[PDB]
From Swiss-Prot, chains A, B, C, D:
Contains a flexible loop (loop III) above the si-face of the isoalloxazine ring that changes position depending on the redox state of the flavin cofactor. One of its GO terms (molecular function) is UDP-galactopyranose mutase activity. Belongs to the UDP-galactopyranose/dTDP-fucopyranose mutase family. This is UDP-galactopyranose mutase. FAD binds at residues 17, 37, 45, 60, 62, 241, 326, 446, 455-457, 460. It comes from Aspergillus fumigatus. Binds 1 FAD per subunit. It catalyses: UDP-alpha-D-galactose = UDP-alpha-D-galactofuranose. The keyword Transport does not apply. NADH binds at residues 67, 90, 92, 418, 446, 456. UDP-alpha-D-galactose binds at residues 60-61, 103, 106, 158, 161-162, 166, 181, 206, 316, 326, 418, 452, 456.
Length: 509, 509, 509, 509
């Protein structure tokens, strides 16, 4: 038959990965193509939302660090101005027994109760002598942890937190994925630091980072999308992909529109990929993976930001006094993530969950905090409770005086929050992925790919870019198959203008 | 002034590297490009010779295990017919103590005296213990050897072999360039062998391969080149470059003709290049590294190839029982390497260097042997003595009976035969190579990029290809920059058919 | 009341230990004393028995190696003549898959099937690399074995044999006791030996050893006893100790004789000790110990000793084709352990368990073999079967041709054969022994002490000696509390004549 | 011809050792003997001396730990009175850059400058790892030291100090003398104690030594000496032994007396013994030995035990500002180690060594510092300076304010202070001792038998007892050839009254 229309290449989804695709597609501009999204608003998970009260919230505190000069090119193109951006220094703390413990946890043991210090140092000495003897390799993530850290830190922080974040015990996932993320401590220097009750806060992927002036992180993907030809895109219920026939290389939509493709690029969750294909084998295979749902909770609050807080960017919570694994001061990122002091809002409620004295709308400055709470079969959540539970956690954490006035409340639940790096993961993937490609499909994304090592924004955008560049110029996908490689380097070669483009506009003479 | 000719990208040299340039270049066909070469006949050092007596001798008799599907693509495009190729499993030997020992060396140690067996093993056991206890690595190749090998093993085989082949010790070499080239010995495996007296030859990158029926290894490049647009090529006095004006982007010839270039790809020897553009910073740099000059000697011999010779291909010579560092049975490769069975040739003279009984021209069939030996300031050779001593060595090594009739002989020598991986090499190259791109020069190859880790035909051709792909599409050269990457993988993505090509075709409608 | 008689010191039992006691007691001569034994014939387990056919058998092949110059003194005194003794070289073999494998097993792997050789060498390489990493210590005997030897030899020989001997799995006993007994292999030299198919038979406690001219090893203790005052001794049913009251320091006998003592020395089995004391606590404690019963089997056989046998002294049987753990050629030791060739005996039966072809008494020379079979709750035995089962095992071991004529048969069962070095042993002893001493009692012996490390004849005799010397001169008991000490040395200080004795006879002037 | 008298045993020298040997000679009371010394006084070099002002000083901080219940027996007997006993908890410090640091110095590193802290700590880390791996053995004292400490603590105590006290580079001394303990730096302890800045030292509740109420350790000597019948002693210029003929077993006395002996115990310096016996070989051999020459200097001071002094016992000095390796406050051991408060004495000099402005003789109370200065040809000393040195450096360490008043001075240089544990010491000893012993000579002593491992008063004493009881009771000399053994145990077995003796006494009935 005749597909309603046909291109050489079809990109499904408007998130960062889909947009990497669209960006290189558009840049080379050799082949027929176009991109679709169920969302009239592009950016997917990387997008932003807002409360009627006027407070903005990302999906869980998205911050920028990139290994890609291409990614950076695209960004600077979409937000070219100096003031389109704010530049911040990473500030991280961990809440343990009343303390704010500077990240990395390790050398900051100095700030601990001396007894817990003792425990940590002990377990760590054990791990050190033991490691001295190793040819071999860690099996589980847990095992890895215990190996690089020691049972003191393991029991104290690592385990409880990492379950709080992953919604599964650290024993049940693997250690393959940790290369530039998770910190492995050096005993000698830790001893030293503790001796001196001093800190080293310089390490981490985040030394400096930047944030969009206004519009939250969703503004990046809006601005980025704006750069494309519009008739080459469809977002809305017209963008919703209902069905896939990989044998006809055709896709059916919500409106029953049909589309042909020579090749396909899909950023949508691979399980839904399969479900939409009606491929029994494939779905059976995709069920083998695991993921965690995220609940995002922001809070509007009245009054100029407290002194107890200040320059703190985001931070973590191992203890069980709070439902959330992490939290973020959004106000610190820019002035535009919350309304203006000048504007008058009424107090929604007291931090202790009580009526304010009255109903009047007053102004003051304000501030914003965004915390995230995980859910899975091993760690469920109750929706109604969970919000109040969070606010409570804030109380308990010495975050808010119960006297504090809550001006705003935000809650939303995301079904696929995280690819879960379980042990079964590589077994399932190494099956799924190549299976797809032989059908001429590139599944890439936080979910399309399902590799969390690679699940950051630049990572995704570059998964799209690479998938494309492979489909055209036969480029290998390093972001995909060689994460430690891509992460362990600055990638300078690929730019938004390539010698091809240069020599074409050269040819124009 | 304007120059006589101008290209987007200028390619110098017919070396497989350069031809990789011209091939990818032509394929994409985006910018203007050409190739210019001194030699009238393509392939350069990959090109083949024949004695006045009708025997073919390559330069070394190069054989193939290929890491490049694109490569095999151009090869199967140049040789689309069935009979075009012959295929063989590898037979490799090592000459010590009146005994032929197969590769890999150590397992087959069972063919040695139980005494030499003993000592070797002991070196290997000590080495094994130390091996379990080191966390660290070798500065030098020698330390490398002794480390994963042991002494008896080393002295018997490794150190001497590498002297004969490099014209240098094992101590003056850096240890970083291998792990493809040589096996990882399991003292266990070696033992189980020695225990049983069992024979298995499995190891090496030489595993199985193809050889051109006719033309030797040079016909390949003849063909592959004849697939290029002719106006895009110059080989002869019309092709020789007398000078390079580096910042004028201009190139000057032996007939006087001139070329400006947007990009410059040199496969030409990096030192040669240095003096050529006449810059003493660069020439000082280049001269910071020296090389081993190589001697190639082929020889034709009368009658059915002997009882002893049989299925063997190439052989290693650690012992001082001769001059030559290694040899090849060239006739083994193809039936067409030697003159026809029916052709009559007289015996030029006996393997014992005396005169023959019959100055008569008779036939038998003929077999051909071809061996190579290096030379340098620290391992000199005599130009007049060499040949004689080679044939002598043939007799000794039990290649020959002095009764044997020499039908033909070949000798020729190349000044730059091998890049030598000095401990000083990268420290220098990290200066030499980078600067060229500041001038827009990709100097790639064996002697172009000076890395034998990627030294071989398919590799060099690849340095060219990738230099192209980087110059157009901004790919990174993992061949040049990252050897173990490309080597430890099969690279399936890059090819003679890519999306660009395909959709040029499709859209043509 | 009045004990029938009273001495200062009472020794119970005439075995080697008891005799050590009596010997030093007598030597010093200071205190009142005497010694009693249930046995009209002294020597206990160290004694000898004889078949009506005239073949004598020890209790399981007792051979002499001593660390004690005092022991040696006593011996030379009792058997002062040159010809009272024979001097032999230790010859030991192990039956594995048809081979006679020279002791020590390890380096004699050369004589093994090359495949089993492989296995052994492998397990051993493992154990070696693993041991290279150890600070730590072996827990069980099994663990010890596997550590020093490797899983090849472990599975092959050590495990099955050691259960065959101990009547308990190696896992269930401790590695504390092995210092000069059990051999721990050196990989390097083992490899070497195997490469050369050669042997090293020089190690062991036994390099040379001696045997009593006539009378078996019982003759030693007969002579040794003869050396004492007779009225100072009681052996018979007049020597049998029925009861002990440690509170009265009095002992009652079979005849109801009663005896007082200031101190007591007891070589009798400590469990029977406690049972005889009627001490509930004690017995409860002594039940915590384990031991193995021994069945001793000798064989009279007709005809001059076979060539297959020769100089072989004794040897071991890991395999399950035979009931017995060990066997000895008694004929080799002395000509007097079997009757004289000149004497005519009838054939009792065929080696295949049949009737001879006549009942007539014929002479020939003869020969003797003494094998031992263990018993315990984990390895029981059937009395009647077990003999014929043994003869059978001989047939199967290529010991006797079924055609061989059996002249003589010996069988006897010993309830306490061995102290079993179970893991529980030290826990039990450290409770039992000091408990005893506070009652002024020294329990010493193979069974009085229950320490097998110390369970050899010289060990025993010296346990008696030391216990005494302690009870008088405040000597420490090194044989007892410091076995590794006594064993790792030649003990030259203590003699049969001491300075005291010399200076007393000096005082006689 | 004839000796003026004949003994079985001749003991040369009245010091601790001679006294031990004698003590058992009588203990046993089997044979005849005589004991001699050239001094009217028993006690040799373990003694005490008294000043004109009535101060007194032991010979170097003689302290109580006995591994021997026998040694104790002798004591308790000698000095019956509890009111003759003074009991002191063990107290110890070291002077480090102004600091008093509780033994062990390791665990108290906490009191130190932080730079030096981490220094020591990296030292111990590196050490604890390399040691983690060690298959090998330390060939020097120093070697083993660093293997214990890590270079940090290594530098900061034992190198400069142990050279201070040993007067030889510790790299020139064996570590073997410290016997069987593995040099396994204990990191967890140091680390933790360092975290806590927690001070932890010497030992208490328990660590203690008793001291004679009056008359010092010479006082002890006379105390237990008097317990002998007088006739068997020769003491004075009279007892002095001027010649040794081991052939006739005659010792020629000073007065012209000569004495025959069956066996000989001689505690005078091994060398000097070789001189007296005029043995050339043994002279040339004793030439091989080494040892240090010692200076003892005590000080009278005015006033009551000071602030910085406290109840502290004795302390060490690694630094170069003071000549002594150690000093003990005698004041605390017995109130009688100094004149009575009411005694009236003049003041010699001022702590800084100025004139007492008043030369009147007044009372006040007093206290006492003894200290010790090392000498070798490696570390020569100056008699003149030395007193004033220990003075100054005493102020350099702030043991005095320059005003502190000195009531008296004691100085003496003891020729043979210490035998040194050089590597060569066993090369000498092991040869020399068998030589002598076979002459029927037991040469035991500080410099008689030469081993610091067992150098204590109790070690000497019991080495003599050991020897004698060898000759008579057939006893091995454990404190002799097994200092690891004797030093590692509770030796309860030999008492001053032995069962033998108790039985002899019962037969006195």
């Amino acid at each position: 038959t005749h597909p309603d229309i046909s291109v050489d290449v079809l990109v499904i989804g408007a998130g960062p990965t889909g947009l990497g695709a669209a960006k290189r597609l558009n840049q080379i501009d050799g082949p027929s193509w176009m991109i679709v999204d169920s969302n009239e608003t592009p950016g997917g998970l990387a997008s932003t939302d807002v409360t009627p009260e006027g407070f903005l919230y990302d999906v869980g505190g998205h911050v920028i660090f990139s290994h890609y000069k291409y990614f950076d090119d695209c960004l600077d193109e979409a937000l070219p101005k100096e003031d389109d951006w704010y530049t911040h220094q990473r500030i991280s703390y961990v809440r343990c027994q009343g303390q704010w413990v500077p990240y990395p946890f390790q050398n900051n043991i100095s700030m601990l109760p001396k007894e817990e210090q003792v425990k940590c140092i002990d377990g760590m000495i054990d791990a050190a002598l033991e490691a001295r003897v190793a040819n071999t390799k860690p099996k589980t993530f847990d095992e890895w942890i215990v190996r690089m850290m020691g049972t003191g830190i393991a029991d104290l922080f690592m385990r409880p937190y990492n379950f709080k974040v992953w919604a599964v015990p650290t024993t049940k996932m693997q250690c393959a994925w940790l290369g530039e993320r998770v910190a492995a401590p050096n005993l000698k220097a830790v001893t030293t630091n503790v001796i001196l009750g001093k800190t080293a806060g310089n390490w981490g992927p985040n030394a400096t980072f930047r944030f969009p002036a206004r519009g939250g992180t969703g503004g990046i993907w809006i601005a980025v999308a704006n750069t494309l030809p519009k008739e080459k895109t469809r977002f809305g219920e017209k963008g919703k992909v209902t069905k896939v026939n990989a044998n006809n290389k055709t896709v059916t939509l919500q409106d029953g529109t049909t589309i042909g493709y020579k090749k396909l690029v899909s950023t949508m969750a691979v399980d839904f990929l399969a479900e939409a294909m009606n491929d029994q084998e494939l779905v059976g295979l995709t069920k083998q993976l695991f993921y965690s749902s995220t609940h995002v909770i922001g809070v509007g609050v009245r009054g100029s930001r407290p002194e107890r807080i200040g320059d703190k960017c985001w931070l973590y919570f191992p203890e069980d006094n709070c439902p959330f694994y992490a939290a973020t001061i959004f106000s610190n990122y820019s002035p535009y993530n919350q309304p203006e002091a000048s504007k008058k809002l009424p107090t929604m409620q007291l931090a202790d969950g009580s009526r304010p004295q009255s109903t009047e709308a007053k102004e003051g400055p304000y501030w914003s905090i965004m915390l995230e709470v995980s859910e899975s079969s091993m760690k469920p959540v109750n929706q109604e409770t969970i919000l109040a539970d969070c606010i409570q956690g804030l109380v308990n954490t010495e975050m808010l005086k119960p006297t504090d006035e809550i001006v705003s409340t935000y809650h939303r639940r995301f079904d696929h929050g995280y690819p879960t790096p379980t042990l079964e993961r590589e077994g399932a993937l190494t099956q799924i992925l190549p299976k797809l490609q032989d059908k001429d499909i590139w599944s890439r994304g936080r979910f399309g790919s399902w590799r969390y090592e690679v699940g950051n924004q630049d990572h995704s955008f570059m998964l799209g870019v690479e998938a494309v560049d492979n489909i055209v110029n036969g480029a290998v996908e390093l972001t995909l198959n060689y994460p430690d490689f891509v992460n362990g380097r600055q990638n300078t070669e690929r730019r938004l203008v390539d010698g091809a483009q240069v020599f074409a506009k050269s040819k124009a003479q």
